[PDB]
Amino acid sequence: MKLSEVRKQLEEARKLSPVELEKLVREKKRELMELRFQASIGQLSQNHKIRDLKRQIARLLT
């Protein structure tokens, strides 16, 4: 259901849009690295966080 949620947020991301798109993506990107960085060490990772964040990025990218 998280889809309907984030979607509206993105045309909502039309304060600055292409610019905030980029700002927001870059952010989600870091969170992703921070994530897999901790995922590699083992004792700081669950799971579904990644794929959810991965696809999260995708629709932002759209």
Partner 1 sequence: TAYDVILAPVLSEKAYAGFAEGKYTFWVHPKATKTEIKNAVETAFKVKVVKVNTLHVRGKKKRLGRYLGKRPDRKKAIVQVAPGQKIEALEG
Residues that bind RNA (CB under 7 A): 1-2, 4, 46-49, 52, 62
**Pairwise CA distance, residues 41 & 54, whole Å:** 19
Choose which of 4, 18, 46, 47 interacts with Mg ion (CB under 5 A). 18
Choose which of 2, 15, 48, 51 interacts with Mg ion (CB under 5 A). 51
36 binds partner 1 (CB under 8 A): yes
Nearest approach, Cβ of 27 to partner 1 (angstroms)? 10
